[PDB]
PDB file of C-alpha atoms and ligand atoms in Angstrom:
ATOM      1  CA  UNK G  11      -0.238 -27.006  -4.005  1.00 24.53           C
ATOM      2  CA  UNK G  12       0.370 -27.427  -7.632  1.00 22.96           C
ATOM      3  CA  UNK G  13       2.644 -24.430  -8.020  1.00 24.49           C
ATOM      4  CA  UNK G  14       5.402 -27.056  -6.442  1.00 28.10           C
ATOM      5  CA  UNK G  15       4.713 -29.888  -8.330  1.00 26.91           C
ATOM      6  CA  UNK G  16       5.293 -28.047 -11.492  1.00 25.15           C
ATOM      7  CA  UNK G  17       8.228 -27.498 -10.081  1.00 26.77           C
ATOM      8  CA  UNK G  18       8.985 -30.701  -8.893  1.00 27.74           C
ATOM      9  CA  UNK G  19       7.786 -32.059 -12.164  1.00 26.52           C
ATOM     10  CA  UNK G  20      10.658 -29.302 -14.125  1.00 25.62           C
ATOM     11  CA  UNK G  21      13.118 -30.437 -12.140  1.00 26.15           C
ATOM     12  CA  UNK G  22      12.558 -34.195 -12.810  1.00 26.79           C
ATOM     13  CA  UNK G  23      12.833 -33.945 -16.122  1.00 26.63           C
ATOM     14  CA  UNK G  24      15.597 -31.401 -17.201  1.00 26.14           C
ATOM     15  CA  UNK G  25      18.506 -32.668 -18.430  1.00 28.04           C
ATOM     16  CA  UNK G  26      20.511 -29.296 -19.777  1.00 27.42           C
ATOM     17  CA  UNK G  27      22.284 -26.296 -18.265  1.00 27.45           C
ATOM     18  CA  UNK G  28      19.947 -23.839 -20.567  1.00 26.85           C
ATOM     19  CA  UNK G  29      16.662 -25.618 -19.207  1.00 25.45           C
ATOM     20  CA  UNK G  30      17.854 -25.626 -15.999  1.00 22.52           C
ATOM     21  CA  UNK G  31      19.030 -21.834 -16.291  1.00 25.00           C
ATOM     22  CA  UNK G  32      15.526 -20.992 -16.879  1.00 24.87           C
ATOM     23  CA  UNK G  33      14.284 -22.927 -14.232  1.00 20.76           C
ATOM     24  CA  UNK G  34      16.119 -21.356 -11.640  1.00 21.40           C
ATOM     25  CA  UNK G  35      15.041 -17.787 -13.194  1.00 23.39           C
ATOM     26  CA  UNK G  36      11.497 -19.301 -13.165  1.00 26.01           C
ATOM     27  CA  UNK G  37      11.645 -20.054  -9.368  1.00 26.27           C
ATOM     28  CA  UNK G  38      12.818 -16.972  -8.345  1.00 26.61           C
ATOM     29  CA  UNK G  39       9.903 -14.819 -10.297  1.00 27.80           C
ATOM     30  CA  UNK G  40       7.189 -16.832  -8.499  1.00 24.87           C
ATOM     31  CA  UNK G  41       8.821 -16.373  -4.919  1.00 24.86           C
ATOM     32  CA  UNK G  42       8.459 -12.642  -6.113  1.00 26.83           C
ATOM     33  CA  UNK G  43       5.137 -13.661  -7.118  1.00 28.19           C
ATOM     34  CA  UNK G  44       3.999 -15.251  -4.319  1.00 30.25           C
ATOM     35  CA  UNK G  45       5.248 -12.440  -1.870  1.00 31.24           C
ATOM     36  CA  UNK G  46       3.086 -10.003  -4.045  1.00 31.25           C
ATOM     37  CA  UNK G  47      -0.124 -12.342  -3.753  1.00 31.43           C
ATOM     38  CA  UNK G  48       0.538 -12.860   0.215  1.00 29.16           C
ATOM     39  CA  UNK G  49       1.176  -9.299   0.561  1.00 28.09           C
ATOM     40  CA  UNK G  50      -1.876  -8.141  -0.881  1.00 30.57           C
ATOM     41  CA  UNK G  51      -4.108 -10.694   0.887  1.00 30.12           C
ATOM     42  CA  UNK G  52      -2.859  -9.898   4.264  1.00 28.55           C
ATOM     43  CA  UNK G  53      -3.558  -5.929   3.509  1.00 29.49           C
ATOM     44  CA  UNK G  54      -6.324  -6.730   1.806  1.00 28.45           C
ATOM     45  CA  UNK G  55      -5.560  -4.720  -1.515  1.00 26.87           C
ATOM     46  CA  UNK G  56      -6.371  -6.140  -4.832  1.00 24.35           C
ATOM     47  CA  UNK G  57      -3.519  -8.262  -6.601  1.00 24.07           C
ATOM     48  CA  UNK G  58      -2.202  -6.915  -9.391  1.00 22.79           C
ATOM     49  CA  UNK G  59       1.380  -8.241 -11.032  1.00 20.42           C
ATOM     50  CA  UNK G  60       2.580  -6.162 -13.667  1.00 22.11           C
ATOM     51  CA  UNK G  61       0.066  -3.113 -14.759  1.00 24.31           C
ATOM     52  CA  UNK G  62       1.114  -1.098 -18.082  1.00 26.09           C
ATOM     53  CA  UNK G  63       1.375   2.985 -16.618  1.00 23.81           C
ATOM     54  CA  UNK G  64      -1.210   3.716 -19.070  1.00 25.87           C
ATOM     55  CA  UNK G  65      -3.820   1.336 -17.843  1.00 24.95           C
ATOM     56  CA  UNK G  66      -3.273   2.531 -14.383  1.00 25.84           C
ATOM     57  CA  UNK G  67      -3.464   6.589 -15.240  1.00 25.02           C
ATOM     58  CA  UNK G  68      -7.070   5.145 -17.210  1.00 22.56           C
ATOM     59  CA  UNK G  69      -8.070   3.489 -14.175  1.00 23.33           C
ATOM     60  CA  UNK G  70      -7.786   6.828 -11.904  1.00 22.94           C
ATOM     61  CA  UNK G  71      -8.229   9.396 -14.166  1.00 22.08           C
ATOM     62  CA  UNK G  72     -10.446   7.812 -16.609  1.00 18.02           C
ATOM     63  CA  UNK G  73     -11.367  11.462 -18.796  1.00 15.41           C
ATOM     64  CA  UNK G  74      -7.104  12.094 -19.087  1.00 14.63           C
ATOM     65  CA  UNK G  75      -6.246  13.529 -22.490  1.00 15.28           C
ATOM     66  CA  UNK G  76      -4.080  10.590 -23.463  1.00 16.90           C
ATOM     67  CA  UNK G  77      -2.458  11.911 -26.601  1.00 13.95           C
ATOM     68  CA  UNK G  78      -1.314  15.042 -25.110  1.00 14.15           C
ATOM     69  CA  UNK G  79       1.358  12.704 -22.584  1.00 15.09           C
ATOM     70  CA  UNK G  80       4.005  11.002 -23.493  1.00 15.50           C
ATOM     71  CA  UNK G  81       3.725   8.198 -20.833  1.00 14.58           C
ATOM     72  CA  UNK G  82       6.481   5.372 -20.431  1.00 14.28           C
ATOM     73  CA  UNK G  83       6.469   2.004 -21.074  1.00 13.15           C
ATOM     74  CA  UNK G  84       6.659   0.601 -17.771  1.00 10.79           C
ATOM     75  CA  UNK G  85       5.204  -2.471 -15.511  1.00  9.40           C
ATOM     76  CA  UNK G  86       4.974  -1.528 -11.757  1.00  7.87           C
ATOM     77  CA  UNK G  87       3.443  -4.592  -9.919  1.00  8.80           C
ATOM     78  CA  UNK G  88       0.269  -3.094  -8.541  1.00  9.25           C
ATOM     79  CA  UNK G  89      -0.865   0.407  -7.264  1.00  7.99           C
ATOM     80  CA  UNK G  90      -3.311   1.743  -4.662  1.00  9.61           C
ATOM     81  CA  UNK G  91      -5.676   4.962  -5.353  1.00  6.55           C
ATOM     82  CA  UNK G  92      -6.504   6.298  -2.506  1.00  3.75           C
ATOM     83  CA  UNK G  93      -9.002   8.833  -3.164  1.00  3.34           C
ATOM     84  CA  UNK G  94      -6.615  11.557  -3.599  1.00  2.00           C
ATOM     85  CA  UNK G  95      -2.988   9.765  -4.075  1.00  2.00           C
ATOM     86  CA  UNK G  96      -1.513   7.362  -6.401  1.00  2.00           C
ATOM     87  CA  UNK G  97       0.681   4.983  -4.359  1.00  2.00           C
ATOM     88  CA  UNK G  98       2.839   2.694  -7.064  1.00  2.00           C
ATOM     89  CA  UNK G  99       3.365  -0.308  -5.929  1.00  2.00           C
ATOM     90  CA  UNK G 100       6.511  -2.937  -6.924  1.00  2.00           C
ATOM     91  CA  UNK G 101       6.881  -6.051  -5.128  1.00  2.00           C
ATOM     92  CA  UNK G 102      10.429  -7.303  -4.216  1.00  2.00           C
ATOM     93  CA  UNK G 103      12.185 -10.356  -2.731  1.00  2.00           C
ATOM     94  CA  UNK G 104      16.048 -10.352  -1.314  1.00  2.00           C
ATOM     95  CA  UNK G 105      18.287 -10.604   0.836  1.00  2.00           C
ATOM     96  CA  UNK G 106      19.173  -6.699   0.614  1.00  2.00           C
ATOM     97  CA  UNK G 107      18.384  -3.453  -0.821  1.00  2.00           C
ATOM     98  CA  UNK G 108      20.553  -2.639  -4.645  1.00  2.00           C
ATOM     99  CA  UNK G 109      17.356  -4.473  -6.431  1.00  2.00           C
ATOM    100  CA  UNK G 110      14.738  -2.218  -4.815  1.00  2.00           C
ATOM    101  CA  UNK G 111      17.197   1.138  -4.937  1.00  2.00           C
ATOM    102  CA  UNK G 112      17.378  -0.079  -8.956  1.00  2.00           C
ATOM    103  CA  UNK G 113      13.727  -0.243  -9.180  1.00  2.00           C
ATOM    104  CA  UNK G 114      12.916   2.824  -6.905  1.00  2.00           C
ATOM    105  CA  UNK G 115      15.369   5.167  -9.447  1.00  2.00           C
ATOM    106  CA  UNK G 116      13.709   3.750 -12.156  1.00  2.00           C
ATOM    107  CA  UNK G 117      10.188   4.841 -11.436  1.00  2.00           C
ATOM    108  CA  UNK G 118      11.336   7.957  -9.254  1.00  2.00           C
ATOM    109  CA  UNK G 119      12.986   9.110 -12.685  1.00  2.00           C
ATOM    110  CA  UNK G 120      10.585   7.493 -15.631  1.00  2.00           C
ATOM    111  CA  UNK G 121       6.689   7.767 -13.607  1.00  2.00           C
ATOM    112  CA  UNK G 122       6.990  11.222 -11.862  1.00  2.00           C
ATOM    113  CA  UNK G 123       7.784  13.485 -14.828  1.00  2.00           C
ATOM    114  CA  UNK G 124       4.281  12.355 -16.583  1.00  2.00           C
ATOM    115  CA  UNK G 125       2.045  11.658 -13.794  1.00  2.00           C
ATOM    116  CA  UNK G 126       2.830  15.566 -12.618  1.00  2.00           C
ATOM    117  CA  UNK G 127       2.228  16.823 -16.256  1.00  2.00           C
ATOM    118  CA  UNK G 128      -1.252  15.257 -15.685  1.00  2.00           C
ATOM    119  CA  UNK G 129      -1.516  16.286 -12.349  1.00  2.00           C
ATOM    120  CA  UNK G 130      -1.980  13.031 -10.183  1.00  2.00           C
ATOM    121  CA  UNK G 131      -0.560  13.132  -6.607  1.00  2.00           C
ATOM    122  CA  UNK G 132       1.755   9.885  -6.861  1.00  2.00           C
ATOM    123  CA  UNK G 133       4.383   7.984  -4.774  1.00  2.00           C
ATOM    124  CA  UNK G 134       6.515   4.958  -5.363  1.00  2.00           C
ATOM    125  CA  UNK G 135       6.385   2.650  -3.130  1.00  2.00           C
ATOM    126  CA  UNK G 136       8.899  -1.063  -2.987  1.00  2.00           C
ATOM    127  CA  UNK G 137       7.810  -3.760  -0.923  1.00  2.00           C
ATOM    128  CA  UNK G 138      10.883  -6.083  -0.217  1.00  2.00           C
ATOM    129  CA  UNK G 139      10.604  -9.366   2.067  1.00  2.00           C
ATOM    130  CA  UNK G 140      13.860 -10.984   2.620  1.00  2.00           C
ATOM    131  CA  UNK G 141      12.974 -14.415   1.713  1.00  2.00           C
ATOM    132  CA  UNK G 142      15.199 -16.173   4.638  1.00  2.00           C
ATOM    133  CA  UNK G 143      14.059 -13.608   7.708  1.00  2.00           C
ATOM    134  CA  UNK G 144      10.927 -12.773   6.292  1.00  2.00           C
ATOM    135  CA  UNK G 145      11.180  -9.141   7.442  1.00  2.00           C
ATOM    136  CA  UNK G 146       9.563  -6.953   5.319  1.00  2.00           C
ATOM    137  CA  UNK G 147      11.011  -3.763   4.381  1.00  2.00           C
ATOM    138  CA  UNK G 148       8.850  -0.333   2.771  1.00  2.00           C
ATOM    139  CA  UNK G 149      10.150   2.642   0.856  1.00  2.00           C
ATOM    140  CA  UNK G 150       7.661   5.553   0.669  1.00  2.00           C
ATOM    141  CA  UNK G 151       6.318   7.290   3.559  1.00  2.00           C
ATOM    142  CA  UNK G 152       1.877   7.455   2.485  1.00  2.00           C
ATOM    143  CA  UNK G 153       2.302   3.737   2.234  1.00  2.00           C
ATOM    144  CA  UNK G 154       3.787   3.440   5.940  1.00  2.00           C
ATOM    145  CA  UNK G 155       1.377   6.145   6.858  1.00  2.00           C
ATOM    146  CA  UNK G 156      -1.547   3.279   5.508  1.00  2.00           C
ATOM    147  CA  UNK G 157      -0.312   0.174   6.814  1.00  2.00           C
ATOM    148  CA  UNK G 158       1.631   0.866  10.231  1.00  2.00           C
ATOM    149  CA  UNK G 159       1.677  -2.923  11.014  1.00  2.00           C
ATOM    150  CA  UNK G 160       2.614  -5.051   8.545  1.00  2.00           C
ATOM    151  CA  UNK G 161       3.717  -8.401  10.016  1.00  2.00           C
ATOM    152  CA  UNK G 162       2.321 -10.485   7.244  1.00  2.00           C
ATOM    153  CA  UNK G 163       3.270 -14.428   7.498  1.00  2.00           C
ATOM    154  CA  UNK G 164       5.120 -15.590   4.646  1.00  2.00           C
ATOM    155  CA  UNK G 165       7.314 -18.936   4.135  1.00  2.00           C
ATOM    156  CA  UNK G 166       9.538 -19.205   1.778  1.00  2.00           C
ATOM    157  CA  UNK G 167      11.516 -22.288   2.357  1.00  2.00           C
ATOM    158  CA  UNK G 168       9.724 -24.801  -0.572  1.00  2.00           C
ATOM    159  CA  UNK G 169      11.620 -22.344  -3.104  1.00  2.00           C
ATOM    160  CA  UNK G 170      14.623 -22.635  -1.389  1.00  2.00           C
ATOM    161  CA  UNK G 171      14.089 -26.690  -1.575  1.00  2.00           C
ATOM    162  CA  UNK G 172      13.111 -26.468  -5.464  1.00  2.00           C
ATOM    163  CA  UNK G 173      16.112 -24.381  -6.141  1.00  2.00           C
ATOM    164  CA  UNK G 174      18.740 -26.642  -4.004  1.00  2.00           C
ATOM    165  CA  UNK G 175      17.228 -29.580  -6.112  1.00  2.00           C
ATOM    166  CA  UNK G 176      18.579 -28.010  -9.042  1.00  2.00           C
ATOM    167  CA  UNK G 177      21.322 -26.884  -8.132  1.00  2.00           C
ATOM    168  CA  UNK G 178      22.383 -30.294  -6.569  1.00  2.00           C
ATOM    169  CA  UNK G 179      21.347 -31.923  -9.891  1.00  2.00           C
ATOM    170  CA  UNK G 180      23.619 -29.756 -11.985  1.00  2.00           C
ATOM    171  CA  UNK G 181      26.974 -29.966  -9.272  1.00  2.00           C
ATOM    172  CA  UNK G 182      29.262 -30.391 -11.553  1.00  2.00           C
TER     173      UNK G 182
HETATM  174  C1  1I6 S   4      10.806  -7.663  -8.461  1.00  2.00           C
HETATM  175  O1  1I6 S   4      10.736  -6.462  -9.132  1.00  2.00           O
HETATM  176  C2  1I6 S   4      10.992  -6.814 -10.440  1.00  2.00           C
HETATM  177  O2  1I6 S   4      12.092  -6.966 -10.842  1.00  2.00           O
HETATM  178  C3  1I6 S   4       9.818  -7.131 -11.314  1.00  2.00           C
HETATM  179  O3  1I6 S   4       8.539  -6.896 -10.809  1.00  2.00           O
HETATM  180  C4  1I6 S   4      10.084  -7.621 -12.509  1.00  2.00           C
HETATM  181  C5  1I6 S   4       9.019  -8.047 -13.511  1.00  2.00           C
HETATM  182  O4  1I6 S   4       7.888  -7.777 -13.289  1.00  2.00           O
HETATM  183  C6  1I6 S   4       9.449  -8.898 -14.732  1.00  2.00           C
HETATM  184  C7  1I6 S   4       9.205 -10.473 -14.395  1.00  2.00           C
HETATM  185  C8  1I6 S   4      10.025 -10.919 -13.171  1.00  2.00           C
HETATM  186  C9  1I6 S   4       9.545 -10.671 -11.888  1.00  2.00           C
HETATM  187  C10 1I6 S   4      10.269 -11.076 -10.791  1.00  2.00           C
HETATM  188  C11 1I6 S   4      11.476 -11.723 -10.970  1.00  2.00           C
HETATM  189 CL1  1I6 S   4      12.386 -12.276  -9.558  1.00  2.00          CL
HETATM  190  C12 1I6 S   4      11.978 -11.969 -12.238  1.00  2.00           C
HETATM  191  C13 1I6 S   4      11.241 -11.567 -13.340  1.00  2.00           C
HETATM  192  C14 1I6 S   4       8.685  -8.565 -15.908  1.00  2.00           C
HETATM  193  C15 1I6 S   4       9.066  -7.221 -16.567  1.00  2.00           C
HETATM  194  N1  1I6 S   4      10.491  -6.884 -16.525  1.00  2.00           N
HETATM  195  C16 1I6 S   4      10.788  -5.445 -16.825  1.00  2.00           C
HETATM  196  C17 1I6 S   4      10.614  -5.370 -18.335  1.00  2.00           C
HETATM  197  C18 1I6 S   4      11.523  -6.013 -19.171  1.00  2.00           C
HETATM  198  C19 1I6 S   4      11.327  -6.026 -20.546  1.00  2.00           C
HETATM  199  C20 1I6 S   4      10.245  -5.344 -21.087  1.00  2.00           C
HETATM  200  C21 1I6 S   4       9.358  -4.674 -20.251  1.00  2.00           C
HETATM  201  O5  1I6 S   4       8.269  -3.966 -20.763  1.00  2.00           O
HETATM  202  C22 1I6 S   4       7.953  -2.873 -19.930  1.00  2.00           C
HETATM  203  C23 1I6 S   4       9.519  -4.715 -18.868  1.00  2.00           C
HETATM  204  C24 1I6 S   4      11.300  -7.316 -15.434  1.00  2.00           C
HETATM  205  C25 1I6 S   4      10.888  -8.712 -14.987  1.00  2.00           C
HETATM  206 MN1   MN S   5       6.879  -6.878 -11.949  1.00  2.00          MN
HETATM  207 MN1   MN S   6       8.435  -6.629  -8.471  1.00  2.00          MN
END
């Protein structure tokens, strides 16, 4: 499992607050990560984490004018094509909702505008496990619609440990 031991191996060795700040970031990006990878392989979609808006409207729509669309500079996680939609896709993991409502405004406001200018049918869609329950919560209705069960087994716990390691190093 060497995605711990790095870790493990981090944690060890730091000796300062700004090390150990990015750490702690460090941990929490791959529990996102690793949600996004379990995810995926349970609904057996292809893993994507972090996909530049212009690769994906090149992917579906491979003849698009490009120079006649302004198209933001944005990251979603992943997306699905389904043969006539465009379901983005953005992984998230907490223990409530103000990251994904943050995310969901974003690319409501930002991917909409230019993917109707170019006329693909597209949704966003945020994943969110809550990394102590493990329930698993969806905004956007085609991606219920396409995966009605969704009980996908996820532990989270060895993050948790990593992070309490640091945390207990740097107390005081
Ligand atoms: C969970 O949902 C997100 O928050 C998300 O997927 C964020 C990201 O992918 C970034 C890496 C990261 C992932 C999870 C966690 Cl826990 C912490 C960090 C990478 C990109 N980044 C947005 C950004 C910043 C700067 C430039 C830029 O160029 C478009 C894009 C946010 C963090
Ligand atoms: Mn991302
Ligand atoms: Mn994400």
């Amino acid at each position: 499992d060497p995605m711990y031991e790095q870790f493990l191996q981090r944690i060890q060795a730091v000796r300062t607050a700004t090390v150990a700040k990015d750490i702690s970031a460090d941990i929490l990006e791959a529990r996102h990560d690793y949600f996004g990878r379990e995810l995926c392989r349970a609904l057996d979609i292809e893993y994507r984490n972090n996909v530049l808006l212009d690769e994906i409207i090149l992917d579906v729509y491979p003849g698009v004018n490009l120079m006649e669309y302004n198209v933001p500079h944005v990251t979603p996680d992943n997306y699905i094509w389904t043969g006539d939609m465009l379901l983005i896709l953005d992984y998230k993991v907490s223990v409530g909702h103000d990251s994904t409502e943050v995310t969901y405004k974003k690319y409501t406001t930002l991917i909409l505008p230019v993917m109707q200018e170019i006329g693909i049918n597209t949704e966003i869609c945020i994943i969110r496990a809550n990394p102590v329950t493990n329930q698993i919560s969806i905004v956007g209705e085609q991606f219920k619609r396409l995966f009605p069960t969704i009980p996908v087994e996820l532990n989270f716990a060895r993050f948790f440990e990593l992070r309490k390691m640091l945390l207990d190093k740097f107390a005081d």
